[PDB]
């Protein structure tokens, strides 16, 4: 799969992207890879902050569905007009596909001013499709209409502001993106991504809540947002262990809600104050489980655009959330993640590009043993 390999461009913070066409003659776009959504919408209109947009007045092969699409975020929203056309990946498999593609035709607080994409490549399931689960995401046409293996992996790696990169290998793996064995946690259920956290360690300590509390209502991998999202109630106590662990330096109480920056002098970050963070995720086997860990350099992130300070600033990237666990681009920058979608499981291994230091590094180990890991799960 070595055409795939080093697909991905991106600047620290406004996400991960994949060149696409659309159309025919190809259309070229600059597209968001996000496993935390199923539609794939793409700029239609000369909205100011876009490099380009989906023409389809050009494209021969367009087809109207003669029906709209309105899609709010909590901050955000897009409005779209729905056909379908020939998608292609060029540093992806040699092959073209006719997919559902949402025409965006307004937007507020969607795009991002100065980012180079113009659209968004929803890769979780048509559960959460909009406007309902018949509008067939990009994957499943991919698989359905070639001999595309059903499985894709990501390998995010982190950095007047930094370029990211990494590596989308559609339809396999490839082991030069990562180092030791792949460890495997089942998809509980197909529409997010969703898995299961069993167990929750901040330099070694437990945080000993009921397992219940780390995944309500839920826990997600989801490569379109930046944070490491916590459920209040765990994100209150992470903290709390992360602050202790930490107490050698003393930091204001905006800084850990994420109201405010931090910065140091260049060069003179302490890393070594900050403890690593493990989950410990549901394995393959009744019983068994595995722990993934990341280092500060995942959750403490660099601000490059603060034209106020001289210093080195960053942002605390653990956040509480109200819609469950959301394994952001925090987790998955440590790792090479394998979406194996035939087996419902989802692997992890440690990244050949992940960004550490001399002394701590990412891990991924097991098997360990935990017991009454399904009831971590959260039912209604
Ligand atoms: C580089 C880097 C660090 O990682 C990231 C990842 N994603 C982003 C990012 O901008 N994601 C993004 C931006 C949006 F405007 C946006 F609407 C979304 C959406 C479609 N997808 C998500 N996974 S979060 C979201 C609500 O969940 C559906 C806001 C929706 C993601 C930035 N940095």
Known sequence: ?????????????????????????????????????????????????????????????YRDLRKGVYVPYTQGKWEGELGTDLVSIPHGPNVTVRANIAAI??????????????????????EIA???????????????????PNLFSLQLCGAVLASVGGSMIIGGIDHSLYTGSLWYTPIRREWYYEVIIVRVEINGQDLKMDCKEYNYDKSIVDSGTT????????????????????????????????????????????????????????????????????????????????ATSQDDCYKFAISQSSTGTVMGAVIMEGFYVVFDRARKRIGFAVSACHVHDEFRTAAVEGPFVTLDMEDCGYNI
């Open 130 to 148: 909009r406007p309902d689960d018949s509008l067939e995401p990009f994957f499943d046409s991919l698989v359905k209409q070639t001999h595309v």
């Open 227 to 306: 944070n490491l999202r916590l459920p209040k109630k765990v994100f209150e106590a992470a903290v709390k262990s992360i602050k202790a662990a930490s107490s050698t330096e003393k930091f204001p109480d905006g800084f850990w809600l994420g109201e405010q920056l931090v910065c140091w002098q260049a060069g003179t970050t302490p890393w070594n104050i900050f403890p690593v963070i493990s989950l410990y995720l549901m394995g393959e086997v009744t019983n068994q489980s595995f722990r993934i860990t990341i280092l500060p350099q995942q959750y403490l992130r660099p601000v490059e655009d603060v």
């Open 105 to 126: 035709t307004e937007s507020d607080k969607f795009f991002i001013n100065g980012s180079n994409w113009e659209g968004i490549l929803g890769l979780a399931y048509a």
């Open 1 to 61: 799969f070595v055409e795939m390999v080093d697909n991905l461009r991106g600047k620290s913070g406004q996400g991960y992207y994949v060149e696409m066409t659309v159309g025919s003659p190809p259309q070229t776009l600059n597209i968001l890879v996000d496993t935390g959504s199923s539609n794939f919408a793409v700029g239609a209109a000369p909205h100011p902050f876009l490099h380009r947009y989906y023409q389809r007045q050009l494209s021969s092969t």
